[PDB]
Design a protein around this ligand. Structure first.
Ligand SMILES: NC(=[NH2+])NCCC[C@H](N)C(=O)O
Ligand SMILES: [Mg+2]
Ligand SMILES: [Mg+2]
Ligand SMILES: [Mg+2]
Ligand SMILES: [Mg+2]
Ligand SMILES: [Mg+2]
Ligand SMILES: [Mg+2]
Ligand SMILES: [Mg+2]
Ligand SMILES: [Mg+2]
Ligand SMILES: [Mg+2]
Ligand SMILES: [Mg+2]
Ligand SMILES: [Mg+2]
Ligand SMILES: [Mg+2]
Ligand SMILES: [Mg+2]
Ligand SMILES: [Mg+2]
Ligand SMILES: [Mg+2]
Ligand SMILES: [Mg+2]
Ligand SMILES: [Mg+2]
Ligand SMILES: [Mg+2]
Ligand SMILES: [Mg+2]
Ligand SMILES: [Mg+2]
Ligand SMILES: [Mg+2]
Ligand SMILES: [Mg+2]
Ligand SMILES: [Mg+2]
Ligand SMILES: [Mg+2]
Ligand SMILES: [Mg+2]
Ligand SMILES: [Mg+2]
Ligand SMILES: [Mg+2]
Ligand SMILES: [Mg+2]
Ligand SMILES: [Mg+2]
Ligand SMILES: [Mg+2]
Ligand SMILES: [Mg+2]
Ligand SMILES: [Mg+2]
Ligand SMILES: [Mg+2]
Ligand SMILES: [Mg+2]
Ligand SMILES: [Mg+2]
Ligand SMILES: [Mg+2]
Ligand SMILES: [Mg+2]
Ligand SMILES: [Mg+2]
Ligand SMILES: [Mg+2]
Ligand SMILES: [Mg+2]
Ligand SMILES: [Mg+2]
Ligand SMILES: [Mg+2]
Ligand SMILES: [Mg+2]
Ligand SMILES: [Mg+2]
Ligand SMILES: [Mg+2]
Ligand SMILES: [Mg+2]
Ligand SMILES: [Mg+2]
Ligand SMILES: [Mg+2]
Ligand SMILES: [Mg+2]
Ligand SMILES: [Mg+2]
Ligand SMILES: [Mg+2]
Ligand SMILES: [Mg+2]
Ligand SMILES: [Mg+2]
Ligand SMILES: [Mg+2]
Ligand SMILES: [Mg+2]
Ligand SMILES: [Mg+2]
Ligand SMILES: [Mg+2]
Ligand SMILES: [Mg+2]
Ligand SMILES: [Mg+2]
Ligand SMILES: [Mg+2]
Ligand SMILES: [Mg+2]
Ligand SMILES: [Mg+2]
Ligand SMILES: [Mg+2]
Ligand SMILES: [Mg+2]
Ligand SMILES: [Mg+2]
Ligand SMILES: [Mg+2]
Ligand SMILES: [Mg+2]
Ligand SMILES: [Mg+2]
Ligand SMILES: [Mg+2]
Ligand SMILES: [Mg+2]
Ligand SMILES: [Mg+2]
Ligand SMILES: [Mg+2]
Ligand SMILES: [Mg+2]
Ligand SMILES: [Mg+2]
Ligand SMILES: [Mg+2]
Ligand SMILES: [Mg+2]
Ligand SMILES: [Mg+2]
Ligand SMILES: [Mg+2]
Ligand SMILES: [Mg+2]
Ligand SMILES: [Mg+2]
Ligand SMILES: [Mg+2]
Ligand SMILES: [Mg+2]
Ligand SMILES: [Mg+2]
Ligand SMILES: [Mg+2]
Ligand SMILES: [Mg+2]
Ligand SMILES: [Mg+2]
Ligand SMILES: [Mg+2]
Ligand SMILES: [Mg+2]
Ligand SMILES: [Mg+2]
Ligand SMILES: [Mg+2]
Ligand SMILES: [Mg+2]
Ligand SMILES: [Mg+2]
Ligand SMILES: [Mg+2]
Ligand SMILES: [Mg+2]
Ligand SMILES: [Mg+2]
Ligand SMILES: [Mg+2]
Ligand SMILES: [Mg+2]
Ligand SMILES: [Mg+2]
Ligand SMILES: [Mg+2]
Ligand SMILES: [Mg+2]
Ligand SMILES: [Mg+2]
Ligand SMILES: [Mg+2]
Ligand SMILES: [Mg+2]
Ligand SMILES: [Mg+2]
Ligand SMILES: [Mg+2]
Ligand SMILES: [Mg+2]
Ligand SMILES: [Mg+2]
Ligand SMILES: [Mg+2]
Ligand SMILES: [Mg+2]
Ligand SMILES: [Mg+2]
Ligand SMILES: [Mg+2]
Ligand SMILES: [Mg+2]
Ligand SMILES: [Mg+2]
Ligand SMILES: [Mg+2]
Ligand SMILES: [Mg+2]
Ligand SMILES: [Mg+2]
Ligand SMILES: [Mg+2]
Ligand SMILES: [Mg+2]
Ligand SMILES: [Mg+2]
Ligand SMILES: [Mg+2]
Ligand SMILES: [Mg+2]
Ligand SMILES: [Mg+2]
Ligand SMILES: [Mg+2]
Ligand SMILES: [Mg+2]
Ligand SMILES: [Mg+2]
Ligand SMILES: [Mg+2]
Ligand SMILES: [Mg+2]
Ligand SMILES: [Mg+2]
Ligand SMILES: [Mg+2]
Ligand SMILES: [Mg+2]
Ligand SMILES: [Mg+2]
Ligand SMILES: [Mg+2]
Ligand SMILES: [Mg+2]
Ligand SMILES: [Mg+2]
Ligand SMILES: [Mg+2]
Ligand SMILES: [Mg+2]
Ligand SMILES: [Mg+2]
Ligand SMILES: [Mg+2]
Ligand SMILES: [Mg+2]
Ligand SMILES: [Mg+2]
Ligand SMILES: [Mg+2]
Ligand SMILES: [Mg+2]
Ligand SMILES: [Mg+2]
Ligand SMILES: [Mg+2]
Ligand SMILES: [Mg+2]
Ligand SMILES: [Mg+2]
Ligand SMILES: [Mg+2]
Ligand SMILES: [Mg+2]
Ligand SMILES: [Mg+2]
Ligand SMILES: [Mg+2]
Ligand SMILES: [Mg+2]
Ligand SMILES: [Mg+2]
Ligand SMILES: [Mg+2]
Ligand SMILES: [Mg+2]
Ligand SMILES: [Mg+2]
Ligand SMILES: [Mg+2]
Ligand SMILES: [Mg+2]
Ligand SMILES: [Mg+2]
Ligand SMILES: [Mg+2]
Ligand SMILES: [Mg+2]
Ligand SMILES: [Mg+2]
Ligand SMILES: [Mg+2]
Ligand SMILES: [Mg+2]
Ligand SMILES: [Mg+2]
Ligand SMILES: [Mg+2]
Ligand SMILES: [Mg+2]
Ligand SMILES: [Mg+2]
Ligand SMILES: [Mg+2]
Ligand SMILES: [Mg+2]
Ligand SMILES: [Mg+2]
Ligand SMILES: [Mg+2]
Ligand SMILES: [Mg+2]
Ligand SMILES: [Mg+2]
Ligand SMILES: [Mg+2]
Ligand SMILES: [Mg+2]
Ligand SMILES: [Mg+2]
Ligand SMILES: [Mg+2]
Ligand SMILES: [Mg+2]
Ligand SMILES: [Mg+2]
Ligand SMILES: [Mg+2]
Ligand SMILES: [Mg+2]
Ligand SMILES: [Mg+2]
Ligand SMILES: [Mg+2]
Ligand SMILES: [Mg+2]
Ligand SMILES: [Mg+2]
Ligand SMILES: [Mg+2]
Ligand SMILES: [Mg+2]
Ligand SMILES: [Mg+2]
Ligand SMILES: [Mg+2]
Ligand SMILES: [Mg+2]
Ligand SMILES: [Mg+2]
Ligand SMILES: [Mg+2]
Ligand SMILES: [Mg+2]
Ligand SMILES: [Mg+2]
Ligand SMILES: [Mg+2]
Ligand SMILES: [Mg+2]
Ligand SMILES: [Mg+2]
Ligand SMILES: [Mg+2]
Ligand SMILES: [Mg+2]
Ligand SMILES: [Mg+2]
Ligand SMILES: [Mg+2]
Ligand SMILES: [Mg+2]
Ligand SMILES: [Mg+2]
Ligand SMILES: [Mg+2]
Ligand SMILES: [Mg+2]
Ligand SMILES: [Mg+2]
Ligand SMILES: [Mg+2]
Ligand SMILES: [Mg+2]
Ligand SMILES: [Mg+2]
Ligand SMILES: [Mg+2]
Ligand SMILES: [Mg+2]
Ligand SMILES: [Mg+2]
Ligand SMILES: [Mg+2]
Ligand SMILES: [Mg+2]
Ligand SMILES: [Mg+2]
Ligand SMILES: [Mg+2]
Ligand SMILES: [Mg+2]
Ligand SMILES: [Mg+2]
Ligand SMILES: [Mg+2]
Ligand SMILES: [Mg+2]
Ligand SMILES: [Mg+2]
Ligand SMILES: [Mg+2]
Ligand SMILES: [Mg+2]
Ligand SMILES: [Mg+2]
Ligand SMILES: [Mg+2]
Ligand SMILES: [Mg+2]
Ligand SMILES: [Mg+2]
Ligand SMILES: [Mg+2]
Ligand SMILES: [Mg+2]
Ligand SMILES: [Mg+2]
Ligand SMILES: [Mg+2]
Ligand SMILES: [Mg+2]
Ligand SMILES: [Mg+2]
Ligand SMILES: [Mg+2]
Ligand SMILES: [Mg+2]
Ligand SMILES: [Mg+2]
Ligand SMILES: [Mg+2]
Lengths: 110, 77, 203, 59, 141
RNA sequence: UCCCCCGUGCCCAUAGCGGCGUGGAACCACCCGUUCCCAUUCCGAACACGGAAGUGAAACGCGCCAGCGCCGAUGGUACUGGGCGGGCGACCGCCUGGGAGAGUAGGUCGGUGCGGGGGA
RNA sequence: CGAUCAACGGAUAAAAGUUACCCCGGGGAUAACAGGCUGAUCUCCCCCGAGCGUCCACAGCGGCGGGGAGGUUUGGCACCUCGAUGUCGGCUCGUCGCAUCCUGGGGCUGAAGAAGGUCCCAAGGGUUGGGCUGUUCGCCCAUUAAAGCGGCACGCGAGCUG
RNA sequence: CGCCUCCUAAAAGGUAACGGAGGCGCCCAAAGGUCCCCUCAGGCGGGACGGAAAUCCGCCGGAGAGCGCAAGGGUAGAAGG
RNA sequence: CUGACUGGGGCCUGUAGAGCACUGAUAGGGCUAGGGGGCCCACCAGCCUACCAAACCCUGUCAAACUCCGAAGGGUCCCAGGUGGAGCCUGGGAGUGAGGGCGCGAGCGAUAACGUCCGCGUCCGAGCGCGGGAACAACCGAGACCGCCAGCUAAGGCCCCCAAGUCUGGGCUAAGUGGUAAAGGAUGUGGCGCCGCGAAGACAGCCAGGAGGUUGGCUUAGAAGCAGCCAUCCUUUAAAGAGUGCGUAAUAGCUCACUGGUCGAGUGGCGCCGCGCCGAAAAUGAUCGGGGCUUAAGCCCAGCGCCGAAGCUGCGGGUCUGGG
């Protein structure tokens, strides 16, 4: 017995995995927001970023943006440029959207 | 006395066309099937009639993923 | 009460050869051991007909050992109606699931009225200690009329033995007899010809 | 190690793949003998027509 | 007499009679049984004649168990037609029976009665039979 | 390189159901709100945003339990590629190579990769 | 774009019958006769022993089912014969089988006798005349020891009839 | 009498009979593309008119519902709403 | 050098078998909506059901168009063996497009057909050339270039017709079974097992006895052990069923089981295997191919030898192809 949440997650993720791009996964808790860029072919995380790791502070949206910018900076350092956004169970909106926009401002390609 | 049967349709020649370890070229049909008895895996596309075919030159590989179904992959040469 | 049966070890001998020599191929096992064995067919038969899967059969092995067993399984030749193989379950100090004979004491009132006592279970499945195996379990069926029934829940169990089937399981029933006086109605009984289940646009 | 294979029973009446096995072994006439290296590929054809053939191990 | 109340298909291919029984080879209800020594299609009318012979012998008392069922439709073309023009019409039903099958069982009756009833029943059947008695071997199945 | 948690994969129930117990510092969740973004064929339930008083009740995680579910030998058998016999037949056997399914013994209340946060 | 060209690879844009007044080319590649194979059907014989027979399963019978034999019926099949194997019935002439109609010999009987019933042995001989109808068959008349049943290309048209 | 589905069909493909069963000669302007969201049948308990079955609430329920129409394949980690 | 065939390896599959989880079928039991029926009510409910029964569960099964399972095999690709009247490519010339028998797997037919229709294989076709099978396209043996008054074998044979054993050892059969058939029937014969009952004297025969409640009852018109049941209880016993059969209109009577005596060692009833017996009637004259065969010249088990083909060998020759 799966949940709307679980189905929704599988649905958007399966679609992403088919394209074979590096996958930018985003986890959003009530307090924090997390991103890891994943190689689903080797099943390994390449680069990571979070509000919990950066000790970010303020408004959740503005924070999200910043963790996005951060993820970008580290990513570009490893030669990671093109990526596919994994909104998972979340609408593309608000905090997730902000992180996405922050990733793009950093020059992550998507 | 007569029969109200006597009908049958043409055989459709369905099945796997390229088995694991076979060297295929892109476009090569791998499987003819009704619905997804096999699912397209890496470097394999699927047509409107569920036909599996190779997207790249390479070597065919099969994989049974339990409840996730049987998949057909092509491994680049 | 308790039975003894000489057994022997076997390795590569063909079951067919053994069987043609009058030897019954078998196996003996538990969580600790597994050995290919054979027993003399007629000797085994004399025992098993008494012992069944109910009473302990100790096997006198040629290496001097003596292992207490229960017959777990007997494979029958479906054509010739003859045993072709035995599973010997080697007992140990742990409680064990097994079949214990039901002994039906009393003559059902239904039977006096012409009925028939259908003994649905002639033994019952039970967890019990090897040191604790009862010889039977009595059941009072004298109260049963046509058509009343007894269940495993109605079983009065001896100390240290626990029912290993659902108490809902029926164990005896008293049924109406065959009767010639019914034959005539059955013979003049018309049957409706079989209905064929609808395929296609018809359901 | 080698196999001396003698054809002793006629392939007439036997399935064509047995007739072909005989040809792979180079056996073409009754009572004809061939000494073949003992490899699995050869052994495989010799076993296929064992009911036609007489085999001996040599040297 | 015995036949399916309903079916998915009106007619069945004839198939084969190789081998010992699939199952049904041990006494499972009564004290005595009638076991098949030869393969055959046993008709519903044969089964009923066997039944009636046994209850007639018992008169009143005892219990008969019929352990085979004729679910296989039997087909025959109308007399004097030629080959072709489709499969013949269903004329009856048969139970497929192979060697080792316990066809009938009795209970609630003395050994003399059971032996005799099963004997008479056997004479109504198109095959050789054997009378058997419930065994530890049966019980262990 | 060890334990806990959070993400995310892999094996595809030995991983599941049920029962019981356990965890809030951290994390996660519920939670507090509905101004703002966004939202309900009605509903801030969901989706979403801003929060941080409280609670681990729900959910989730982690243990333990074999009632169920799942897995499951070894023996032996059915069946059989190839080779031979027997029957008037329905059919029945032998040799060699292969060899189930059911059932029995027994197993199982998961295992593992990568990256985070924390602990030693 | 115009196809129930649906006989759906679709002969013409355009098409039904009849022949005992018939004709040719072919086929035993294919029917009707006879044979053959088969034996469902047919005829006969068994097994079982429910029940009938005042009583008594078996004198005489035999529910429901079961196993066969024969190759005289009606068929199935299509194997020799379509550069021909003349097909019903009768007459003539037989000859064979026996599952026997009579005569001969038996057992059982619900065999008193006489007469029967039923089964067993037995094919040597015998097995009528007539009315009806093409008839075979069958019904009928008068008798009889009896008025048998089948096979022989449903025996016999280079023997007759028709 | 063409076409589709299943079986016969002897575990690749193919495979006949006047063998066993069913369908087609349409349809849809959305019943098509895409993005987003949602998840069934059924069982039990509860609820005016309301019923075996209308709509509502709770619990169980991996797919037995649905997918225009035959059958088969497929399918909720959607092809279904 | 890629071929048929073969070794290894991977992938594909849903048959045989099996199973019942799905679709359906399914006997019995349990449980339990729904009716039928019976008591009891119209005041709307109650109680009883040896009644037909859904769902569910249990035991036990069935299926081409069922599958929780699932072989042996088969297919295909890769590497390797494979030099063959193998393979692939281009082109010239065809013929064939009536098949048939047999084995196995199915369908149709009737678990018919020298039947019919497919599948895999085979042989005849075209090997009606050769040996065997009495004779006989396709069953067994075997693929005939020619010659030999040489040898070895195959199937099949070795008593005579008729080449080679009246060969050797163990067993069975008495029916000419062998040398056409089934349900079924039977103190035919032999081998194994299983029981009992027996010198606390059995079985067989010959001796007695075989009895009371009791002509017992559901129970009816006769029903006295012996015309159906839903009955078998006791008494005196050495023993004797409320009875095995014959008997009777019922009675009676005979007998059984039954206990004692007489003899003195075995006796009775099961079951598994081998070989025989009956069941067994069809048409011109019979017959296993014939003669004839019985510790076989039959059947089963185990042997040694030989005969036997146009197969194989020896010798000589031809021709084509390949190598010198
Ligand atoms: N591959 C095999 N060995 N198959 C055996 C079956 C052959 C034969 N029907 C028998 O029962 O013996
Ligand atoms: Mg029609
Ligand atoms: Mg058809
Ligand atoms: Mg058609
Ligand atoms: Mg077809
Ligand atoms: Mg086709
Ligand atoms: Mg098809
Ligand atoms: Mg395939
Ligand atoms: Mg497409
Ligand atoms: Mg499409
Ligand atoms: Mg792999
Ligand atoms: Mg791959
Ligand atoms: Mg025994
Ligand atoms: Mg429809
Ligand atoms: Mg040969
Ligand atoms: Mg040759
Ligand atoms: Mg041959
Ligand atoms: Mg072969
Ligand atoms: Mg092959
Ligand atoms: Mg040769
Ligand atoms: Mg040799
Ligand atoms: Mg058939
Ligand atoms: Mg029949
Ligand atoms: Mg039929
Ligand atoms: Mg006709
Ligand atoms: Mg037909
Ligand atoms: Mg028919
Ligand atoms: Mg019938
Ligand atoms: Mg059977
Ligand atoms: Mg019989
Ligand atoms: Mg079972
Ligand atoms: Mg985690
Ligand atoms: Mg739990
Ligand atoms: Mg707590
Ligand atoms: Mg918990
Ligand atoms: Mg907290
Ligand atoms: Mg706290
Ligand atoms: Mg507002
Ligand atoms: Mg504001
Ligand atoms: Mg809210
Ligand atoms: Mg939320
Ligand atoms: Mg707060
Ligand atoms: Mg909690
Ligand atoms: Mg959650
Ligand atoms: Mg444990
Ligand atoms: Mg499994
Ligand atoms: Mg298993
Ligand atoms: Mg095994
Ligand atoms: Mg075979
Ligand atoms: Mg066969
Ligand atoms: Mg076998
Ligand atoms: Mg084998
Ligand atoms: Mg083996
Ligand atoms: Mg299997
Ligand atoms: Mg297994
Ligand atoms: Mg578990
Ligand atoms: Mg994990
Ligand atoms: Mg991994
Ligand atoms: Mg970690
Ligand atoms: Mg860490
Ligand atoms: Mg036009
Ligand atoms: Mg039409
Ligand atoms: Mg046409
Ligand atoms: Mg036309
Ligand atoms: Mg068309
Ligand atoms: Mg056409
Ligand atoms: Mg076409
Ligand atoms: Mg034209
Ligand atoms: Mg035209
Ligand atoms: Mg025109
Ligand atoms: Mg016209
Ligand atoms: Mg026209
Ligand atoms: Mg004209
Ligand atoms: Mg005219
Ligand atoms: Mg006219
Ligand atoms: Mg005229
Ligand atoms: Mg004229
Ligand atoms: Mg004229
Ligand atoms: Mg005129
Ligand atoms: Mg004219
Ligand atoms: Mg002419
Ligand atoms: Mg012409
Ligand atoms: Mg002409
Ligand atoms: Mg003809
Ligand atoms: Mg024609
Ligand atoms: Mg004709
Ligand atoms: Mg004709
Ligand atoms: Mg003709
Ligand atoms: Mg005719
Ligand atoms: Mg005629
Ligand atoms: Mg004629
Ligand atoms: Mg004719
Ligand atoms: Mg002729
Ligand atoms: Mg003739
Ligand atoms: Mg004939
Ligand atoms: Mg006949
Ligand atoms: Mg006949
Ligand atoms: Mg007949
Ligand atoms: Mg007879
Ligand atoms: Mg009799
Ligand atoms: Mg009477
Ligand atoms: Mg009498
Ligand atoms: Mg009577
Ligand atoms: Mg009689
Ligand atoms: Mg009759
Ligand atoms: Mg018959
Ligand atoms: Mg008859
Ligand atoms: Mg005839
Ligand atoms: Mg005739
Ligand atoms: Mg005819
Ligand atoms: Mg005829
Ligand atoms: Mg005809
Ligand atoms: Mg013809
Ligand atoms: Mg012809
Ligand atoms: Mg023909
Ligand atoms: Mg003609
Ligand atoms: Mg002429
Ligand atoms: Mg002529
Ligand atoms: Mg002429
Ligand atoms: Mg002439
Ligand atoms: Mg005559
Ligand atoms: Mg006579
Ligand atoms: Mg006389
Ligand atoms: Mg006389
Ligand atoms: Mg007299
Ligand atoms: Mg008189
Ligand atoms: Mg007389
Ligand atoms: Mg007599
Ligand atoms: Mg005479
Ligand atoms: Mg005469
Ligand atoms: Mg005469
Ligand atoms: Mg006259
Ligand atoms: Mg006159
Ligand atoms: Mg006249
Ligand atoms: Mg007349
Ligand atoms: Mg006249
Ligand atoms: Mg007339
Ligand atoms: Mg008249
Ligand atoms: Mg007179
Ligand atoms: Mg007289
Ligand atoms: Mg005649
Ligand atoms: Mg005729
Ligand atoms: Mg006629
Ligand atoms: Mg004539
Ligand atoms: Mg005549
Ligand atoms: Mg004539
Ligand atoms: Mg004339
Ligand atoms: Mg004439
Ligand atoms: Mg003439
Ligand atoms: Mg003439
Ligand atoms: Mg003449
Ligand atoms: Mg003439
Ligand atoms: Mg005339
Ligand atoms: Mg005229
Ligand atoms: Mg097929
Ligand atoms: Mg198929
Ligand atoms: Mg296929
Ligand atoms: Mg195949
Ligand atoms: Mg193809
Ligand atoms: Mg037609
Ligand atoms: Mg139609
Ligand atoms: Mg829309
Ligand atoms: Mg849309
Ligand atoms: Mg619901
Ligand atoms: Mg409700
Ligand atoms: Mg209401
Ligand atoms: Mg309602
Ligand atoms: Mg569905
Ligand atoms: Mg090569
Ligand atoms: Mg190749
Ligand atoms: Mg190859
Ligand atoms: Mg290979
Ligand atoms: Mg099967
Ligand atoms: Mg089922
Ligand atoms: Mg089961
Ligand atoms: Mg079957
Ligand atoms: Mg089956
Ligand atoms: Mg099938
Ligand atoms: Mg199947
Ligand atoms: Mg399995
Ligand atoms: Mg395989
Ligand atoms: Mg293969
Ligand atoms: Mg392979
Ligand atoms: Mg090579
Ligand atoms: Mg070459
Ligand atoms: Mg060639
Ligand atoms: Mg060639
Ligand atoms: Mg040329
Ligand atoms: Mg030319
Ligand atoms: Mg041609
Ligand atoms: Mg041509
Ligand atoms: Mg043609
Ligand atoms: Mg043709
Ligand atoms: Mg033809
Ligand atoms: Mg053909
Ligand atoms: Mg043809
Ligand atoms: Mg054949
Ligand atoms: Mg054979
Ligand atoms: Mg066949
Ligand atoms: Mg078929
Ligand atoms: Mg033919
Ligand atoms: Mg045939
Ligand atoms: Mg046939
Ligand atoms: Mg052929
Ligand atoms: Mg020709
Ligand atoms: Mg030949
Ligand atoms: Mg040839
Ligand atoms: Mg010839
Ligand atoms: Mg000759
Ligand atoms: Mg010959
Ligand atoms: Mg000859
Ligand atoms: Mg000769
Ligand atoms: Mg011949
Ligand atoms: Mg012939
Ligand atoms: Mg020849
Ligand atoms: Mg040659
Ligand atoms: Mg010699
Ligand atoms: Mg020989
Ligand atoms: Mg001779
Ligand atoms: Mg001589
Ligand atoms: Mg000899
Ligand atoms: Mg001698
Ligand atoms: Mg005689
Ligand atoms: Mg003789
Ligand atoms: Mg004779
Ligand atoms: Mg017999
Ligand atoms: Mg005897
Ligand atoms: Mg005997
Ligand atoms: Mg005596
Ligand atoms: Mg009385
Ligand atoms: Mg008296
Ligand atoms: Mg006889
Ligand atoms: Mg001797
Ligand atoms: Mg010679
Ligand atoms: Mg030569
Ligand atoms: Mg030379
Ligand atoms: Mg030369
Ligand atoms: Mg040449």
């Amino acid at each position: 017995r799966l949940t709307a949440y679980e189905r929704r997650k599988f649905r958007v993720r399966n679609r992403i995995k088919r394209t074979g791009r590096l996958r930018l996964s985003v986890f959003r808790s009530l307090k924090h927001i997390y991103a890891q860029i994943i190689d689903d072919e080797k099943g390994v995380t390449l680069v990571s970023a979070s509000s919990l790791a950066l000790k970010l502070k303020g408004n959740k949206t503005e924070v999200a943006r910043q963790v996005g910018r951060a993820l970008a900076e580290k990513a570009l350092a490893l030669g990671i440029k093109q990526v596919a956004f994994d909104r998972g169970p979340y609408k593309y909106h608000g905090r997730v959207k902000a992180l996405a926009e922050g990733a793009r401002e950093g020059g992550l390609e998507f | 006395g007569s029969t109200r049967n006597g009908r049958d349709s043409q055989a459709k020649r369905l099945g796997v066309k390229r088995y694991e370890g076979q060297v295929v070229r892109a476009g090569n049909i791998l499987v003819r099937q009704r619905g997804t008895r096999f699912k397209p895996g890496k470097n394999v596309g699927m047509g409107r009639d569920f036909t599996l075919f190779a997207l790249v030159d390479g070597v065919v590989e099969f994989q049974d993923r339990g409840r996730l179904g049987r998949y057909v992959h092509v491994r680049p040469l | 009460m308790e039975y003894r049966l000489k057994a022997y070890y076997r390795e590569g001998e063909k079951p067919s050869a053994l069987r043609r020599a009058g030897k019954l191929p078998g196996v003996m096992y538990n969580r600790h051991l597994n050995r290919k064995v054979y027993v003399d067919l007629v000797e085994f038969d004399k025992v098993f007909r008494q012992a069944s899967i109910h009473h302990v059969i100790v096997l006198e092995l040629p290496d001097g050992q003596s292992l207490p067993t229960l017959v777990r399984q007997v494979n029958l030749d479906k054509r010739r109606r003859r045993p072709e193989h035995v599973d010997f379950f080697v007992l140990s100090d742990e409680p064990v699931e097994m079949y214990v004979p039901l002994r039906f004491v009393g003559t059902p009132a239904g039977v006096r009225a012409g009925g028939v006592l259908q003994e649905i279970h002639r033994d019952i499945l039970v967890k019990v200690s090897p040191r604790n195996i009862p010889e039977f379990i009595e059941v009072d069926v004298s109260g049963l009329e046509i058509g009343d029934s007894l269940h495993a829940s109605d079983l009065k169990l001896p100390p240290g033995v626990e029912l290993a089937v659902s108490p809902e399981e029926t164990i005896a029933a008293v049924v109406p007899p065959e009767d010639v006086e019914k034959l005539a109605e059955e013979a003049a009984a018309e049957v409706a010809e079989p209905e064929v289940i609808k395929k296609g646009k018809e359901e | 190690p080698r196999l001396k294979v003698k054809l002793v029973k006629s392939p007439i009446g036997y399935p064509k793949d047995q007739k072909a096995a005989l040809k792979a072994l180079g056996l073409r006439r009754l009572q004809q003998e061939r000494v073949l290296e003992d490899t699995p590929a050869i052994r495989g054809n010799v076993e296929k027509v064992a009911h036609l053939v007489r085999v001996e191990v040599v040297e | 007499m015995l036949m399916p109340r309903r079916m998915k298909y009106r007619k069945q291919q004839r198939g084969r009679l190789k081998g010992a029984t699939k199952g049904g080879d041990y006494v499972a209800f009564g004290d005595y049984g009638l076991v098949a020594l030869e393969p055959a299609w046993i008709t519903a009318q044969q089964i009923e004649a066997a039944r009636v012979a046994m209850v007639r012998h018992f008169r009143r008392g005892g219990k008969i168990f019929i352990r085979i069922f004729p679910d296989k439709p039997y087909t025959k073309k109308p007399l004097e037609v030629r080959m072709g023009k489709g499969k013949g019409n269903v004329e009856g039903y048969v139970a497929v029976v192979k060697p080792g099958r316990v066809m009938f069982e009795v209970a609630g009756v003395t050994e003399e009665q059971a032996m005799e009833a099963l004997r008479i029943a056997g004479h109504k059947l198109p095959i050789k039979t054997k009378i058997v008695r419930r065994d530890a071997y049966d019980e262990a199945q």
